Swiss-Prot record, chain A:
Belongs to the class-II DAHP synthase family. InterPro entries: Aldolase_TIM, DAHP_synth_2. The gene is aroG. Keywords: Amino-acid biosynthesis, Aromatic amino acid biosynthesis, Cadmium, Cobalt, Manganese, Metal-binding, Transferase. Gene3D superfamilies: Aldolase class I. Binds 1 divalent cation per subunit. The enzyme is active with manganese, cobalt or cadmium ions. Its cofactor is Mn(2+); Co(2+); Cd(2+). This is Phospho-2-dehydro-3-deoxyheptonate aldolase AroG. Catalyzes an aldol-like condensation reaction between phosphoenolpyruvate (PEP) and D-erythrose 4-phosphate (E4P) to generate 3-deoxy-D-arabino-heptulosonate 7-phosphate (DAH7P) and inorganic phosphate. The keyword Cytoplasm does not apply. The keyword Nucleus does not apply. GO terms for biological process: amino acid biosynthetic process; aromatic amino acid family biosynthetic process; chorismate biosynthetic process; protein homooligomerization. GO terms for molecular function: 3-deoxy-7-phosphoheptulonate synthase activity; manganese ion binding. Pfam families: DAHP_synth_2.
Amino acid sequence: GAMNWTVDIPIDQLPSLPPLPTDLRTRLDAALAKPAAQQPTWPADQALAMRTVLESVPPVTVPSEIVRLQEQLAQVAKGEAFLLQGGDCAETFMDNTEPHIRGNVRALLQMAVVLTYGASMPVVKVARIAGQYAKPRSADIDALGLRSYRGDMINGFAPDAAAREHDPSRLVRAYANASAAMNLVRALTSSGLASLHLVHDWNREFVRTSPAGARYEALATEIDRGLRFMSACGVADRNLQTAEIYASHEALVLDYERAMLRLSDGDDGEPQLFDLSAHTVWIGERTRQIDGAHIAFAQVIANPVGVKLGPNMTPELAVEYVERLDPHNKPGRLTLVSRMGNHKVRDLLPPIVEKVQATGHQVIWQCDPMHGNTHESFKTRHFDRIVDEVQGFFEVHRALGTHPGGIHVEITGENVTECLLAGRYETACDPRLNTQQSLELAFLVAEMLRD
Amino acid sequence: GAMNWTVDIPIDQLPSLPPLPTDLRTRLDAALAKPAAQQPTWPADQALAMRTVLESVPPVTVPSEIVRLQEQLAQVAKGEAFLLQGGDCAETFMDNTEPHIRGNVRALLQMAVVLTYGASMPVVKVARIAGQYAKPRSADIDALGLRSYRGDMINGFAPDAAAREHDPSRLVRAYANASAAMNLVRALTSSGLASLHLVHDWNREFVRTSPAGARYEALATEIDRGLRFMSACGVADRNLQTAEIYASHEALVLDYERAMLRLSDGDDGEPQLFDLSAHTVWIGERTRQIDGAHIAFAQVIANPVGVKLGPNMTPELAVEYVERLDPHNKPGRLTLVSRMGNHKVRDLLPPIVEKVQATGHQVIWQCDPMHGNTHESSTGFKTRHFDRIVDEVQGFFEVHRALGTHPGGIHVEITGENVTLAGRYETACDPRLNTQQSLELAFLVAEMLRD
Ligand SMILES: [Mn+2]
Ligand SMILES: [Mn+2]
């Protein structure tokens, strides 16, 4: 109650949920019985109580949006669209506010106009938002001797032991934060925030008040003339696609993902399991065990999925991911997310690309220039290394004649640090690019797209 | 806990955003110094703490949707559109589920297409949803000798004393539920659920399987032919609209409404206070004291508002509402909601309408045939006669026809489930018309609209 600073929710006399088709039950249980890395260590009975609450809430997303996303991603996979994915490294309940969310929505719309122009093709916009509340860790004890912070879905950022304990009630606070943020992203994307003219006036402000501004002025002016041309031709906002921003996060906490599963109706074909906590999810580098629960869970859901591929990836293993995760040969169903470091991508990526291409499957190739790039000191990342990874990624694909399909970026609408610091280091986890650096990267990637 | 079948969800105490401007807060404080009827009895310190939580959460609606609704309501006020408002008498946390929300959304869209055809003008769709969690009560002790149930925002439905205490942790729980429901209504209304052709196929199934189906066959077939005609003229899905369903509830719990106040960004007109817990709200019969806090709160917010007018209403008091609540003469800013009873509306409404018309202001005249037509059945249950409901609407139309004024809308309490007289009594409050009856009523009101 208010006196205890808690919301009390009775679980009993809640039930009556329709059973899954027998095969889906069997497969889902088989998937979840496999070993699972990076899971919270909280009690099974408390976890179950939280899942029962979540099994009956309104979903974050609906199946029809997910099949629409799959159709748009199929275009990307065929070389006819580009994927922009970006947002907070880790969302926090603390920053889950209208200014912060609007900041991320705007930054992503800004980047998308620039990339659409540079690419001369549609850009699919996927935010890391409305559920990016869990993060894997190498070590279970951090530099201070505390149990590691694993994101607000699991424990608290505060540096004391009680705050670090794994708290299954965070599954429910994660959901409430997620749907509040998704609700606002839907409102914002059908407001005037999404009109291209407005979005690009922001980019022109960036060009004035920026040290590298002169570098980007020509392209910003070219884009502005392209937009004014559109209107001169009689194209008004009403004659356009309303902005669609999709929600994604790493599918890490299987207690959360399984509780957000819903069965589709009879208007696809056969009923299918959709993870309705997001439109698309990805499986990270530490949870991608080929026979682990995460890959297997991914095989059971209908959502598009991604898999992060680090420097230790082989062509053979990459092909096994494709055959397990895209077994019906559905373009767009699978994204392979390269995160290799700028010093390694030119050498390690081509043989992987060649092998997968040879299978006849059409994956999206997406560059994650964040997580292969890092250095000692504050966790931080050089902008030039990030740019250079995306650059080498484009070189790999140009040489093979394959599609450089997208980028996956960690960013904020906030004027933060990390780009070389103590001034406003604000992240709950990894170094982002601030507003400015994100935008600068879009411009630079637009140039690689024109080339 | 484990012994209890209850889970306690901690409410995160998070950093506050900047406060609302001092001048608007000074105005609000003066308004809320007025006495307020029907308020929860929870302590001021708990109420304050809960409000503070809610001052920084993402809003449920945004200012631009509210100004859009205002524009569409101005059309209603001018006799060029029709207002449909409907949904649960009281939403509960327990029934705030995908199936129940989808069923109410469908019912409203179904009713809307029938009334649009009958009216030959646009219908504005306002759901009683995403916040209808508080009800007034005439006594504080119910028939079981317990403190009265006042809605899930205030206390619990369960017939036990602990549940009936007023706990302002329910403010936060209400917010999370409202957000999640609004999220789902946005998703549903840009899915194929919204498609006119799909919607009316439900209407045709209703005609096939209902008794007295043959009474509505002709209009249903007529409407079908109207849709096939527009499709034959090349009109496809995307030339129509996106379905817009707005959220409304009674502004009852001022701690909730005031915590949800936000300042607009000033990119439109100048910055002002909007209640972003909903698009529009109304003030009920028990809380409309001309000098009370509810009417004063309504003066300060930019949202469109309604006031329920019962049988004791005088033409002079009605004019006072117009002067307080539409001082600037903005058509459709105020809706006067007539709930007189079917035996009283023909006599009591005309002098109210005449006097208000004489002001020069353009209110929306909306008929609420529910809260004047309640009784209790011989077999215990609180009920309402369908025929009496129809006749009040009938009477409301006759008053407007005779005056040359616009019968502007209906306000109805309904569900998408097949509810009843002891078989399926499930409301938590007043007897909703079921799916079928609310639909049937739309057919009947369409015929009154054609006349
Ligand atoms: Mn990261
Ligand atoms: Mn009622």
